[PDB]
Amino acid sequence: MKNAPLTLNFGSVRLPVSADGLLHAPTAQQQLGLTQSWEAALVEHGLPETYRDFGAGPEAAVSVPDFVALAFALDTPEARRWQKRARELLARAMQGDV
Amino acid sequence: MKNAPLTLNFGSVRLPVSADGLLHAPTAQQQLGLTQSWEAALVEHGLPETYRDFGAGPEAAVSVPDFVALAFALDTPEARRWQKRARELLARAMQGDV
């Protein structure tokens, strides 16, 4: 699971992805500064239990909308980077995308 | 000031803009659901007093970064649309911009 066969390559960040575009939830947890269990996160935030085969058989999965809704539910340092990124994209889309 | 000579055309929304890319702060207030004075907003949120000629002589101005930092400082309905938009752009930039 360290040589994922599909990745969403966003910055220097490289998240593993299912053929239908769900993210590898472990990796999501690293990028959002969670240390709680994925079962705990799912319960706390009203997220669906989903799994996808990321090349290592089924593992927990999170949709991109939901990864985002979490980044803005958390207050970790890491989730704040994600949030700041969301704000910068809004700024750039308003300057003409440039 | 209803036929602004430069507009940032974002959605159906059309904000007036200075030659150096500042937004018309009145219009910013409408779009962010403020009814307080622009002097009050400037004080409350730690914004600079700026003015630009938007075709009607100098009027208060707000930078795009600052319009954004406010949309995420407010909790109005309108500022929430702006925020939701910031989240959608993050989602799309992660799906490849598509």
Swiss-Prot record, chains A, B:
Location(s), subcellular: Cytoplasm, Nucleoid
Effect of R81E: Retains two distinct DNA binding sites similar to wild-type DdrC, with a high- and a low-affinity site, but shows a reduced high-affinity DNA binding site
Inducing factors: Induced to high levels following extreme ionizing radiation exposure. Is induced after gamma-irradiation in an IrrE/DdrO dependent manner. Also highly induced in response to desiccation stress.
Superkingdom field: Bacteria
Recorded phenotype for the gene knockout or disruption: Cells lacking this gene show a normal growth rate, do not exhibit a decrease in the efficiency of natural transformation, and is as resistant to ionizing radiation as wild-type. However, deletion of the ddrC gene decreases the ionizing radiation resistance of the ddrB mutant strain or the recA mutant strain, and appears to increase that of the pprA mutant strain. Moreover, cells lacking both ddrC and ddrD exhibit a slight (two-fold) increase in sensitivity to ionizing radiation, but this phenotype is apparent only at the highest applied doses.
Domain characteristics, as noted in the entry: Is composed of two domains, an unusual N-terminal wHTH motif and a more classical four-helix bundle at its C-terminus, which is domain swapped in the DdrC homodimer. The domain swapping creates an asymmetric dimer exhibiting two distinct DNA binding surfaces corresponding to a high- and a low-affinity DNA binding site.
Function: Appears to contribute to D.radiodurans capacity to survive exposure to ionizing radiation. Likely functions as a DNA damage-induced nucleoid-associated protein (NAP) that contributes to the enhanced level of nucleoid compaction after irradiation by bridging DNA duplexes, thereby limiting the dispersion of the fragmented genome immediately after irradiation to facilitate subsequent DNA repair. In vitro, binds both ssDNA and dsDNA, and is able to compact circular DNA, circularize linear DNA, anneal complementary DNA strands and protect DNA from nucleases.
The protein's assembly and partners: Homodimer.
Protein name per UniProt: DNA damage response protein C
Gene expressing this chain: ddrC
From-to range in the entire protein, with total length: 1 to 98 of 231
